[PDB]
Amino acid sequence: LRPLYMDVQATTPLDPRVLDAMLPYLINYYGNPHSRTHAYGWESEAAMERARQQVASLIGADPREIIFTSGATESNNIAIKGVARFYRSRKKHLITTQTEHKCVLDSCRSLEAEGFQVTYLPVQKSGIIDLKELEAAIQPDTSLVSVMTVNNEIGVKQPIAEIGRICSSRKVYFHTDAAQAVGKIPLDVNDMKIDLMSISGHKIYGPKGVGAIYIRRRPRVRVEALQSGGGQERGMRSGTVPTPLVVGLGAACEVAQQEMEYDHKRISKLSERLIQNIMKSLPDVVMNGDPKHHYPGCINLSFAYVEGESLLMALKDVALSSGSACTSASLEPSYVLRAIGTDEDLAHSSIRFGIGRFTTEEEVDYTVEKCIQHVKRLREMSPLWEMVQDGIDLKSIKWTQH
Amino acid sequence: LRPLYMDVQATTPLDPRVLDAMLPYLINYYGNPHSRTHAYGWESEAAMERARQQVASLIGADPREIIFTSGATESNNIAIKGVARFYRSRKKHLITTQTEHKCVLDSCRSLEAEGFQVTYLPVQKSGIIDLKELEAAIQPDTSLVSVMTVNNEIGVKQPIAEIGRICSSRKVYFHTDAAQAVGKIPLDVNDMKIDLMSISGHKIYGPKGVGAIYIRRRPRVRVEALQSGGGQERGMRSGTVPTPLVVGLGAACEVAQQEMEYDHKRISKLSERLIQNIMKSLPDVVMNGDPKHHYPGCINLSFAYVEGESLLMALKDVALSSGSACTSASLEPSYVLRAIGTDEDLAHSSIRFGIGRFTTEEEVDYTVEKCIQHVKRLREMSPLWEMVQDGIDLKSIKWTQH
Amino acid sequence: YHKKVVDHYENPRNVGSLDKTSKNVGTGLVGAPACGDVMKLQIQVDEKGKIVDARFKTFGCGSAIASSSLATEWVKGKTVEEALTIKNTDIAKELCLPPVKLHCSMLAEDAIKAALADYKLKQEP
Amino acid sequence: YHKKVVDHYENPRNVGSLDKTSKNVGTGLVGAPACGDVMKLQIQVDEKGKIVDARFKTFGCGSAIASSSLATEWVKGKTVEEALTIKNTDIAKELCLPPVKLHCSMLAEDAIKAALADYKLKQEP
Amino acid sequence: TIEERVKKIIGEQLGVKQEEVTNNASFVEDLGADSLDTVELVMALEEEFDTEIPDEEAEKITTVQAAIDYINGH
Amino acid sequence: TIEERVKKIIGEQLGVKQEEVTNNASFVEDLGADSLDTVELVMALEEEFDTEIPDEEAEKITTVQAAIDYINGH
Amino acid sequence: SRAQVLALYRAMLRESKRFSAYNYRTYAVRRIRDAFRENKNVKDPVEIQTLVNKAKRDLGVIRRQVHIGQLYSTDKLIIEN
Amino acid sequence: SRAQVLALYRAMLRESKRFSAYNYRTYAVRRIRDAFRENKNVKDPVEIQTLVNKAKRDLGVIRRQVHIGQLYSTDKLIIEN
Amino acid sequence: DVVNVVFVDRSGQRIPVSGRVGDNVLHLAQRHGVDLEGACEASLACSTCHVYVSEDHLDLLPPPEEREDDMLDMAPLLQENSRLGCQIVLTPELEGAEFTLPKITRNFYVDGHVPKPH
Ligand SMILES: *P(=O)(O)OCC(C)(C)[C@@H](O)C(=O)NCCC(=O)NCCSC(=O)CCCCCCCCCCC
Ligand SMILES: *P(=O)(O)OCC(C)(C)[C@@H](O)C(=O)NCCC(=O)NCCSC(=O)CCCCCCCCCCC
Ligand code: FES
Ligand SMILES: [Fe+2]
Ligand SMILES: [Fe+2]
């Protein structure tokens, strides 16, 4: 028997409607969309333009502002590096947050190795940036501000509209990484003052290996292409456009636009159920992030005095994720939980639950029951729990490392 | 009724075996291969490693030397820019040919914009480079030599093994663009002394939007990554690895390894049939490229005194390709045919025929018959043909341009 | 391909040639600057100064062939002054030519002008 | 997860504690440097110098819990000198630990040494 | 018992606390159910008692007695 | 004519110049064909004369006369 | 149109209960039930006609995806036991 | 094994002829006929058994792909007229 | 009505040109032997008339239309002072304007080939 899937922040299953839309182009319509001389190419091009319009309609953009990529990693690279390199002659400063995704953070680090100056904005305990700090951090030579819409690890929502208003007033390009937000919360590029936006296909029940970046046409934002070649995608992303993948992305965007309100209502109900049932039975469990600015589909909880990987091993029948360093290939601690001020041992105790379009109340209840039983067992095994029961403060211990 | 497909160089249809291999991961095994903590991730990771071994087995490499990409455009960018940037502190010179693909050529041009020196080697009238010219062109500060295995437009084969021997003798990294060669002619990275190689999925009856690059481990070749992020693919290509696409690529490589000899024997027969039947019925038809070093699946013919786009429009029932500037979005003339010394009017008259794994003798003869009839019709329309029939030399004409 | 261009390419009008040694026939042979398209347009002018016959031969793309055919059918029936008023904008508007195919309409107008100038030069003492 | 680690995790051996006060019991509480794993190991030594009982409590990953359990039963039955010969390499070789989990075997060896040192420290006049 | 299982599914499908399902209670008037609920109740009956009720026989199933009679007869 | 069409496909499927096809020529001995060729000939007969020849009847079709008799009878 | 709507609802439910995968099966059943109950009080025949056509398209999608998922099937989930 | 091989050959040909796409149909028919004629003189029973197992796997693939391509079918080619 | 402009070619050579009001920059450069490609002949399809405009005159041009902006997206080595030479018309405010030719165009000529004048 196969375990339950509660890891939708990592990836999502393909929607059957999306697969149904894709299959004709994997069977019969296999032509190159860039072939200008025959009907295979013409039909592939028409399907690709249909998908472009679907994505643009989902985010409230003109279709000409959508560029297809291989994923949100490529989209983030294009946004950050292309903007920074294109305006290099006058602007040398970039702004982002300490809680951004690794692709954004690594692009900024490699730009710092390229001579740029980068400011990493701190966040409050709630996981939200301070608009006063951003406004004070903007320099006359600032090129780009990058703040993600929904955090992939704790699910906090940044004030995107306020940030965009500030950036527009200061004449700074505003980019947002919306990989975890598209098709889940409302987005409007013109209402928000967004200049660039990253989109990922497999976070919205579309295919893996495809993404898109929104680039504003009025007033025109320019980027310097990272992938050289024949000039596909308005000269900004060379290479053959994968027609089945982009058709699937467009179909997924249309489905999300049709399903968002219902999905959000269902997920909010399920999330409150999970959180209340966990908290009503387990003491010393804390949610990471502020409930007031939270996307209910991403629930990050800390189980005090229990190590996250050991809890995951105990939950062999549920697919989950943890922020513990022992689940990292390089023993990397969770920088997001460090940034929001979580103490280190609690950060080692964090578990991420994902609730999406296909999650059932049956699965939620099963997960809650298994978590309760296994946290009780591991706390009975925990020396930290024993010491806390004995009144010995954990901060005062003189641990003998080596 | 739908037209016949003879445009395999642009893209290929998906092999049903490849689709059969892909579908389970589009339906049930949808997990993220980088998820280290549950069974969905473990099974995705195992499928990815299986595909990596399949590709490595096809090209004769160790599996650890294969890095999955989004296509041969990305592979070419990674090879050229990564090697050039990594060895930037000592080596500043790159060597390639005038007939390379646009991704390679544009990578070299953009490198010329960041300070590198690039030499574009000429080719002989046969389409084959001169080894003496390459040996004379190698400098002590030369980093990389890039020559494609099989040309996408005229189908000539470069002496890859000899080039690799020369490069090894001179301590110069040798890269080859093998997008049109993999799974069609034998390839061995160690026998040919190749250091880097580009691979494309949709040129070998695999899915679009996926590719691979071979990077030699002994002695170690280093590249500087172009896509920043979480460190996937041994730090050289960040981003989520698209498990269905890489599984399809591996299945296609396995099928090609099993079917190559049979496919080559049939393709060679069909190509000889097409060429002889065209030439025995139409005067003034010349083949571009040398038959002695040619891949039979890519046939480039010039039909004198007939414009290529008009011939393509006459062949509304066959999907083909032409080198005419009137088929270009920017009126670009064919630089490959310019490089091999084809006179422009003939270069404007060139048609590319593709013969692949699924081409039939029925389709070949239908194409030949339609070509004969329509070339006769267009020559009866041709003022150049009238002037030639009247003995007036075309070179001596004083054309009144504007 | 736009259907008007397809119709003109599918069924060209007045493909052929005329005796260019005759007094009342002008021949215009022109070529495109950024590509290989070549047009040869010939016209026949009667005693009244009216164009009674026109022919063309084109080496070029389908849009170029359509432009030459349309130019022949528009040139038949007019006078020299009327034929001097046909513009590449009109040809392109009729064939619905995209921007990349405007060289075809330009070459068709150039061919009309070349033929008319050739006839006028032949009609000089 | 390797099946040996899974066995030790799902059926841990000698989970509990021993009366810290008792003359013949040593307690070893150690922590890992680059992660949060914490190990507490307690042993009981008889009059003959043999270890008769051992217990552990681990806050850490599954490999850490397995290393702790394996160290306990390995420690039971030996003397102090023999238990001083239990290196981390042996623990890791038995559990088939990958390089990233070697901190678990290191911490288990540290816990064993800490417990033995605590015991004679208690056995000093 | 056949009718015991029939009443059990009717109660589970309609939410009537397993006490209002009598031998003369109708699905629409007495119990709280619309046409969609009736469709689903018929399908649930088909699933428990393995069979394929035709449209004509399904339309006649408006009461617990009708369902019991159909299941017992078939 | 039924047997004319039978002889035509036999000739097309075996390559015998449409003149070696007779009423007593076997497929293996007289004409040049193996068991795979016989399988394909039977399938071609099935296609032209729409039918589903069973295995027992297909094994009895070793001669042109057998094929003609089966097609005429069915 | 009431009989047509009931027949379409019955066909959608019966075909959706044949999904091999647990997530797709549960989602399709819930979604159909919720949508038909949501549109229970619509009045405009044009809107009813549009919803019916959309439901026929959705039924076609469900049929094809059910058959494909039966062709490529995996083990059941732990909670189905 | 001769009867088993002949039955497998008949089944492969019969199902491959049901391909909706012209390219796949012609390729599958020609490939099966070339491969069976290629292995007509093999003698090792181990090799024959391996080939037969491969052919059974290939027949399964052909069945699934034929059904999927019948679910998603397009117009015919100009040469099939 | 005389406008004096300067063309800077790829080699760096500075070419004084005495133009006129209402002139087109691409045609005016081709009449004076400046190797500006201009393949599509001011049809806004090729982007090979791409030029750099000197900073003291860039803001004096009419702002580009979005059709021009779309064609400029296809031009390699794009800069903030990039314009399409076929869309620029000479006015007295453009006295002293300098047009520098970029090193490469949209069309590939890595062999060194130079297209014949249009
Ligand atoms: P009963 O007492 O007759 O009451 C029920 C009905 C609807 C028949 C009755 O109330 C009525 O006739 N009302 C008039 C309005 C009406 O007909 N409503 C229904 C319109 S059709 C409809 O709502 C279709 C919804 C389709 C949803 C498809 C979901 C697909 C999900 C796919 C997942 C992969
Ligand atoms: P006939 O006189 O009976 O002779 C024919 C046979 C094969 C029955 C006879 O010669 C014999 O028994 N020979 C012994 C060896 C033998 O059995 N050969 C055949 C072995 S099975 C075989 O070759 C399978 C080939 C499978 C091809 C698969 C093609 C798949 C195409 C896929 C397209 C997507
Ligand atoms: S000339 Fe083609 S765009 Fe200016
Ligand atoms: Fe043309
Ligand atoms: Fe650990």
Author numbering:
A (entry chain E), B (entry chain A): 56 to 457
C (entry chain D), D (entry chain H): 35 to 159
E (entry chain G), F (entry chain C): 3 to 76
G (entry chain F), H (entry chain B): 5 to 85
I (entry chain I): 69 to 186
Manuscript text:
The process is initiated by the mitochondrial core ISC complex, which synthesizes a [2Fe-2S] cluster de novo from cysteine-derived sulfur and ferrous iron (Fe2+). The sulfane sulfur (S0) of the persulfide on ISCU2 is reduced to sulfide (S2-) by FDX2 to initiate [2Fe-2S] cluster formation. FDX2 and FXN compete for binding to overlapping sites at the core ISC complex during de novo [2Fe-2S] cluster biosynthesis.
In the (NIAUF)2 dataset, 61% of the particles belong to a class in which FDX2 is bound in the proximal conformation, and 39% belong to a distal-bound FDX2 class. Additional weak density at this site, typically associated with conformational and/or compositional heterogeneity in cryo-EM, was further assessed by C2 symmetry expansion and focused 3D classification. This revealed two major FDX2 conformations that we refer to as ‘proximal’ and ‘distal’ according to the distances between the [2Fe-2S] cluster of FDX2 and the FeS cluster assembly site of ISCU2, namely 23 Å for the distal conformation and 14 Å for the proximal conformation. In the distal conformation, the [2Fe-2S] cluster of FDX2 is too far for efficient electron transfer to the ISCU2 FeS cluster assembly site (23 Å), whereas the movement to the proximal binding position brings the [2Fe-2S] cluster to a distance of 14 Å that would allow rapid electron transfer for reduction of the Cys138ISCU2 persulfide. When bound in the proximal position, the C terminus of FDX2 is ordered and well resolved, interacting extensively with the NFS1 subunit. Contact is mediated by hydrogen bonds (H-bonds) between Asn175FDX2 and Cys-loop Ser385NFS1, a salt bridge between Asp179FDX2 and Arg393NFS1 and hydrophobic interactions of Phe176FDX2 and Val178FDX2 with Leu160NFS1. When FDX2 is bound in the proximal position, the H-bonds between Asn175FDX2 and Ser385NFS1 could provide additional stability for the ‘outward’ Cys-loop conformation. Residue His186FDX2 is resolved only in the proximal conformation of our (Fe-NIAUF)2 structure, yet does not interact with other residues in this complex. The movement is achieved by a rearrangement and tightening of the salt bridges between NFS1’ and FDX2.
